Amino acid sequence: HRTAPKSDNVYLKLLVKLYTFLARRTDAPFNKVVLKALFLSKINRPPVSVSRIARALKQEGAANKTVVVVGTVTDDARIFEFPKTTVAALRFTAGARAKIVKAGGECITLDQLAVRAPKGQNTLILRGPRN
Amino acid sequence: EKILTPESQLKKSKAQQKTAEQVAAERAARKAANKEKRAIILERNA
Amino acid sequence: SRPQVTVHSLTGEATANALPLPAVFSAPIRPDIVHTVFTSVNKNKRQAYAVSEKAGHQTSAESWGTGRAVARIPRVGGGGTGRSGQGAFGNMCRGGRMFAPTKTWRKWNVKVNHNEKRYATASAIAATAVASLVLARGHRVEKIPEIPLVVSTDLESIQKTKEAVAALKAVGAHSDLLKVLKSKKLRAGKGKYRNRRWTQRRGPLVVYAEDNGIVKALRNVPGVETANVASLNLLQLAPGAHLGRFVIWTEAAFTKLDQVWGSETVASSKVGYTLPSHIISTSDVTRIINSSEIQSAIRPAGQATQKRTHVLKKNPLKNKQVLLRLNPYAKVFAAEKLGSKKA
Amino acid sequence: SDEIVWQVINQSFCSHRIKAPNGQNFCRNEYNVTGLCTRQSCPLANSKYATVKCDNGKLYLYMKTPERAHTPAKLWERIKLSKNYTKALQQIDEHLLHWSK
Amino acid sequence: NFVKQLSSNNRKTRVNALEALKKYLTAKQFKENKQIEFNKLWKGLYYAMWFSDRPRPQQRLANELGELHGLYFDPKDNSTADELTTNDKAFIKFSRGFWKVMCFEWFNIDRYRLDKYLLLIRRVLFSQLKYLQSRNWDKKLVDEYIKKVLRWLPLSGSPKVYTGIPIHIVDILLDEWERLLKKTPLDVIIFQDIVADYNNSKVLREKIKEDLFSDTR
RNA sequence: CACGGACCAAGGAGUCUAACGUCUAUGCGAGUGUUUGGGUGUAAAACCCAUACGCGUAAUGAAAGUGAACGUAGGUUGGGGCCUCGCAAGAGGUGCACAAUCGACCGAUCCUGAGGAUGGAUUUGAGUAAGAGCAUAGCUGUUGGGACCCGAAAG
RNA sequence: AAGCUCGUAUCAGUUUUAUGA
């Protein structure tokens, strides 16, 4: 059982501050995923490629979905094509950030996300490849 | 002129009363629901 | 675009001209990085010290041996000297060699990431425009006519110290200099005799863009460090890794400050550098939570502190009154006697 | 912000706290209401903030709006409070209209 | 410019700046064009509102600011049996300004400042509408304006908008619609069309369905 | 048993460093590392950076080589979540990481022999599934250094 | 100690019935 984050970054403690609140007051178990997820260590917040985002929206009916990654979005040069999709994360590498702006969609923070999706309506949570 | 409530504070009274009039209706229908409950228990113990 | 900063002149009056915010001042105020960056950077201006390689081995002492009814520590030879027949060599022994002698090649300087290093100063600079942050760091800034205090470029030209403190009196830092000055104390250490005899408080930092005699003007007035906007130290900005030194900027410095760091509009100047991005949007949480938004999709609240149920165990059997809350029948059991039943 | 001023001064140094032996903290900022350094009690974290001070025998009700954050000199905005304690409390409640209880 | 006089740290210049703008807006022909210069004007008038945290001049300023939409194109000239004759056209851009700015700035407004901007968003939607002419009965205006409210904020299908924003209109429209002092152009209940829509804000969807349609009017 | 202790004061023992790791934190991220050096300075600080280099970014082999899409970079099964219906209980859809099975491409196999073409025989892989790294710091591990301190017959 | 799946029908220094030398 993991309790509170081992991080020192005070902007991250501000997120938890919100999500520990939204966990217990909303009772949509979306929140109880993210809030547990925030705490995770830096070898277990593996970085999500903008490629692994593009794969995840090929998934059927997911044309209108705010994909969320508690970790970081990384830029990829391999893929030309990218959907107009709203993407929330902790870190957007300058590269990636751009790769999403030019494609039309928004790159958004977990608290932007917490507002737009309080209970977490119509979301998709991805994970970076642990092994 | 004269001063108004803040719009957040104005919303409070609106969503307190949506609960307070909700809760005192829940409570008063439970006071009867336990009065009836009591009477089931009494007749069972006998 | 943001608000825009007013510029005052060296009499203390607001001139109609006002400068835009540089938006280095919208960096993340990360006190965590400032600390872990300061520390290393503070250890960088350090000297070595060691103890003398010879010292301790400048004795010709011999271990007495087994079965001699005295302890087996190496003892000095000789005679009639009183240093004869006594303990040298060994950390315990008076005049012996100190345990694992300090060497010169301890790591003294500390390698930092150049990016981290920079991030730090941005945070530092940000926090230097917050006022409350600055008031908590020390710095009597109750009378400064605005933060960040930006001053007319004719401040650089002032030659004679006497006039340039009157630049500051008019601006209002009259107090902050008297915070220093009054604070002069003897060091409380052995620093009384390692040339650290005195210590006073850290005054305002002045930031000029190009010198016309400001650096010398103020080099006397106690505590008042100035810096060229091109450098801008962490150690002057976060003194002792406490965020937010009170800073006077000059009009020219302030304008250039945008070039130095960069915004959305302008380039950078530091090569391929960009000011860092926030992992939140608003550095405030209680605007997210006391919302119209979130409070609309939420189950209602408690009392904050529960009205405890069952504090003390009233037992039935004794106490009739509880024996009526459990089981209402027992009133009926007592009106009919029921224990006393005839057949 | 403020929630970013607090948690810095809260831990990481508000160079005017007194640690009582008790453990208790005490914001000696000559402006706060409760001598204690506590969120929504420190005049530094919180942005709307009132107090009474005395000056001479004259007891003023200083108030600090968050409009004025730009300009630390005209920060506080004081008011002489009558001196019949009865009117004075009513005097107070007037100004506090619609603040935190 | 006007933005910088309106977003001044000096109070006394922001009083005068606004009055000059009022004369300038009355002048009208100059401001005939450019969505972005209008957008900006609004951004400028945002900072002026933010410099009033005292309790009753923000109660003065918000109303005067909304009041702009009125003085800006007055129905004394009266468009009758007429289209969008540069009074109406001017209004339909100037609304879009406010509703851009206030959509852009919903996150960035601070707790103790949020009181103002809600009061401003009330006064503005009341003083909008107020100019649909002298009245709200403007058949060729209304359907245009219902496409320059609908297409910008009450849409909800846009997540780009801050779903706390409609929620506020939702509460307020009825108490200020009746600050008109019966029937009119209410179409407006766009609400019916979206209560309706799937793939939106489950929050608004249930905030409209409880706050709007529970009331009889 | 035995070893130590008459008493009191002061001293008095897991340190530093090098290599190599683990974990956590921070920065950035397919990159990453300013500090050999130069420029600059209020000067052993701070602030700037050219060219390189280091480690990583695209693999299968033994002398020679080749090159990763039949593809929503798969077919199913689960699978945190999310979406529809239901007061709920449930059911239905979509399925992340991951796991299991069927496979394929690439290289290498067992043959057929037009110097090795072509088709079959089957598996294999720090293989690709569609990058996670780099650096600084902390706690700490192993090994070398006098190496927790004191003590030996020596040449 | 951390990570992943579960949070259960995951088991137990236990008894019973069933089925053999």
Best of D67, D74, D75, D95 to mutate (most E CBs within 10 Å, chain E): D67
Rg (CA), chain E: 17
SS3 D74: coil
Which residue range is the domain that position A84 belongs to?
1-131
Residue with tokens 């030194």: C245
CA–CA gap between residue C158 and residue C218 (Å, rounded) = 10
Torsion, CA C56, CA C62, CA C65, CA C68, rounded to 10? -90
Contact C105, C54 (CB under 8 A): no
Q: Over the range A80-92, which residues count as b (16 or more CB within 10 Å of their CB) and which as e?
A: eebbebbbbbbbb
* H or E element at residue A73: strand A66-74
How many other CB atoms sit within 10 Å of the CB of residue C84?
11
Q: Could you give the CA distance from residue D100 to residue E12 in angstroms, rounded to a whole number? A: 31
Beta pairing, strands C74-76 & C61-63: antiparallel
Q: Calculate helix-pair angle for A31-39, A10-26, nearest 10 degrees.
A: 150
Check which CATH number belongs to the domain holding A12 and give it: 3.100.10.10
Using alpha carbons, list the distances in angstroms from residue C322 to B44, C319, E143.
Answer: 19, 6, 70
Does A115 contact C293 at a Cβ distance shorter than 8 Å? yes
C128-C19-C28-D12 Cα dihedral, nearest 10 degrees? 10
The Cα–Cα gap between A26 and A16 comes to 15
One CATH from 3.30.9.100, 3.40.640.10, 3.30.390.110, 3.30.70.1290 for D1-101: 3.30.390.110
**Structural domains of chain A, count:** 1
Which chain A residue's Cα is nearest to D8? A10
Nearest by Cα to D99 from E120, B3, E61, A21: B3
Give exposure, A13-31, as e/b (b: 16+ Cβ within 10 Å): bbbbbbbebbbebbebebb
* Chain A interface includes C274 (CB < 8 A): yes
Q: Could you check: is the Cβ of residue A125 within 7 Å of any atom of nucleic acid strand G? A: no
State the first-to-last Cα distance of chain B, in angstroms, to the nearest integer.
71
Backbone φ and ψ of C63, nearest 5°? -70, 120
Longest dimension (CA), chain D: 44
Measure the CA angle with vertex A111, ends A105 and A117; round to 5°.
70
Burial degree of D74 (CB within 10 A; 0-12, 13-18, 19+): exposed
Report whether E187 contacts C315 (CB < 8 A).
no
Q: What SS3 state is found at C62? A: strand
With the C-alpha atoms ordered E157, E34, E144, E46, is the resulting torsion angle positive or negative?
A: positive
For chain C, strand residue ranges (E) read 4-8, 14-20, 61-63, 74-76, 149-151, 185-186, 198-199, 205-208, 225-228, 247-250
C42 Cβ contact partners less than 8 Å away, ≥ 6 residues apart = C235, C241
Q: How far is Cα E46 from Cα E37, in angstroms, rounded to an integer?
A: 14
Helix (H) or strand (E) holding C40: helix C31-42
> Measured CA to C1', what is the nucleotide nearest A1?
G2
Resolution, angstroms, 1 dp: 3.6
Residue C132 φ/ψ, nearest 5 degrees: -60, -45
Nearest by Cα to E101 from E178, E146, E35: E35
DSSP string, E2-43: -HHHHT-S-HHHHHHHHHHHHHHHHH-SSSSS-HHHHHHHHH
- Identify the helix (H) or strand (E) that includes residue A109: strand A107-109
Burial of C87 (C-beta count, 10 Å sphere; 0-12/13-18/19+): middle
Please answer whether residues E211 and E161 qualify as being in contact, where contact means their C-beta atoms are separated by less than 8 angstroms: no
- CB under 8 Å to C150, separation ≥6 — which residues? C5, C6, C7, C8, C19, C248, C249, C250, C251, C254
Write out the H or E segment, with its range, that includes residue B8: helix B7-45
Say how far apart CA E163 and CA E143 lie, in whole Å: 23
- Rounded to the nearest 5°, which phi and psi values hold at C309? -100, 140
Q: For residues E125 and B7, give the distance between their C-alpha atoms in angstroms, rounded to a whole number.
A: 15
Length of chain A (residues): 131
Residue with tokens 């939702």: E170
C-alpha dist (Å) from residue C170 to A16, C72, C107, C151, C154: 46, 76, 47, 11, 14
Q: Are A57 and A65 in contact (CB under 8 A)?
A: yes
The amino acid at C124: A
Residue E49 tokens, joined: 């509102």
Q: What is the DSSP string of E132-159?
A: TSSSS--HHHHHHHTTSSTTTSTT-S-T
What are D45's two structure tokens? 């974290």
Q: Exposed e or buried b for every residue in D6-31, given b needs 16+ CB within 10 A?
A: bbbbbebbbebbeeeeeeebbbebeb
Amino acid at C261: W
Give strand F nucleotides closer than 7 A to any protein Cβ.
Answer: 10-18, 23-35, 42, 44-50, 72-73, 80-84, 93-99, 130-132, 135-137, 146-153
- Residue C175 to residue A62: CA distance in whole angstroms: 62
For A16, phi then psi, to 5°, come to -50, -55
Say how far apart CA A9 and CA C220 lie, in whole Å: 39
User: Which chain E residues in 135-194 lie under 8 Å from chain A, judged by CB atoms?
Assistant: 159-160, 162-164
Residue tagged 């009061």 (tokens) = E119
**Contact criterion met (CB < 8 Å) for D3 and C145:** no
* Tokens at C73, concatenated: 């520590």
For residue B10, the one-letter residue type is L
Distance CA B20, CA B17 (A): 5
What is the tally of helices (H) and strands (E) in chain E?
Answer: 11, 0
Q: In angstroms, how far apart are the furthest CA atoms of chain E?
A: 50
Q: How far is E124 from chain B (nearest CA, A)?
A: 14
**Rounded CA separation E42/E99 (Å):** 9
Q: Which of residues 203-242 of C touch strand F (CB under 7 A)?
A: 208, 215, 219, 225-228, 230-235
Name the nearest CA neighbour of A107 among A95, A94, A97, A118: A97
Strand partners, C199: C185
The three state secondary structure string of C166-215 is: HHHHHHCCHHHHHHHHHCCEECCCHHHHCCCCEECCCCCEEEECCCCCHH
Distance CA E45, CA C270 (A): 36
What is the helix (H) or strand (E) element at residue E174, kind and residue range? helix E164-177
Per the listing, tokens 């804000």 go with E201
Residues of E whose CB is below 8 A from A118:
203
Question: CA E118, E120, E126 angle in degrees (round to 5)?
Answer: 105
Q: Phi/psi of residue A128, each to 5°? A: -80, 150
For chain B, the C-alpha Rg in angstroms (whole number) is 20
